[PDB]
Symmetry: C3
Subunit: 190 residues, 3 copies
Amino acid sequence: ELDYRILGESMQTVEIELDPGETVIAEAGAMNYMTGDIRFTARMTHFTNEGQGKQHVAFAAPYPGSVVAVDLDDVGGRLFCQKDSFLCAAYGTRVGIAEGFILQKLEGDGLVFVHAGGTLIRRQLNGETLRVDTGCLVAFTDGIDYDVQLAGLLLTTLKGSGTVWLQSLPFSRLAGRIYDATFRAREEVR
Amino acid sequence: ELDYRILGESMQTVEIELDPGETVIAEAGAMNYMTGDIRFTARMTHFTNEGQGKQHVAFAAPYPGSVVAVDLDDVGGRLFCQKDSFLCAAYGTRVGIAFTKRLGAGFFGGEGFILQKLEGDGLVFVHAGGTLIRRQLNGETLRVDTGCLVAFTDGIDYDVQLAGGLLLTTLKGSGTVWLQSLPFSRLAGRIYDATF
Amino acid sequence: ASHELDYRILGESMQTVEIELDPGETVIAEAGAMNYMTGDIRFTARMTHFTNEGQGKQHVAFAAPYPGSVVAVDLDDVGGRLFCQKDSFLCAAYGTRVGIAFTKRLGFILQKLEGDGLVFVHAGGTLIRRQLNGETLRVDTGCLVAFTDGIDYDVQLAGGGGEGLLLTTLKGSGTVWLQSLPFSRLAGRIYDATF
């Protein structure tokens, strides 16, 4: 279905090629630019080529990092992913769940696009168990038993054969640490 | 007039090499370091080499992304620049405002959306958050998420609309556009209202 | 003697250190830094110690909460001592002694790292390494990642938000590590533009 180009080295934007007829779906506010005949509509926000040219719409996440293109057919037409990490999808993708940490399921035959904050980390699992700061979980396949747990620092335990995609800098860690660091300036009142 | 080297790969800083008597202008919150005989004066801050040999001062924007040198000669002696995107310029650069406009109750409700005009015959350095997307127009229409506009040459018309909140900038006409994938306004905005 | 860690630095401009621990080896990092860990890694609180409690080579990964690169510094290459901005510190071999060299509130903490093992600092934006040979360098205070003995320093309000530029003056002989995008600049600029 969709053609695309992933621009940038460590920080990435995905330029979606939309031929006349084709739609692409994305979270509100991910879009960078539209060429000419692209038109958009709210309901998830859908971008469609309304004219007659090979056209472009670019998307990028609101924190620094890389975009991974995942052909759904390459992974049994299913991919689990953290709601923050979802960037965009070939129209006719089923979403839904599987503001606390949210895991989403995406399934279909098309292209899906996920963002990994900071470093992208890809690992193959073969019976091995991997433990993962929960926010650092980007996406994973089937064949992976996952289990979220707690200290008292929320940890996710993964086990099986299959693929996990991790990120070194989740948006939640970045935003929370930014807030923390602002303490003095905001203490200046009381 | 100015020698420089751009350091780093995806995240960048500009180290300006100053000969004796030479000057670079920058907002002073962008400076990272300066060698010994560099002096600075509030009017934009001016950094001058007050020594006898080569001196250095480096500058970086306060959000991740890359630096581009733009020779004003190469673009008619005028560039339009989002203010957050201005990094530094050679002394003699004429820096003015081409456009100021508040816009709603989000990020551009604060300071506002500000386009500067940079004119002259020297070197200008601008910064693009995330990756830089450079585009030549050739009588075409480009619609851009408003904060994503870094810089543009003459021959390009622009105006900002509230779309269907979605702030859109429509570009139409000639030359070169410089766009950024992760504008500070998007970075700061999403972070602001997420810690809320 | 500190444990002898192995490692690999993952990524290009935005990096993470994956530390490799042999049975019974330990690495020290602040809580919240770790990204993943293999099956036999265990951890306890005091800064938390991550230990290979099982068999063979095991791995824990760590990153800083802002974009930049990782620098491995072998303390032996620096006479057993590194000065380090607090936020720049990422992780260190067990046996590393962490002290406070400096604190100043001007309206900013330097730790001292000591031992014979590996330490890992983080540089926001780009790393700029510089060598001083009897010279003075003036830096934006947050841009200071680390330095060696031989270097004299102080933090002052620049003077000449609408106020508050901190300037660090460095002088002497040794290595200085600088970052182009300090967390404090990033946090402060975001705060100013939104809050």
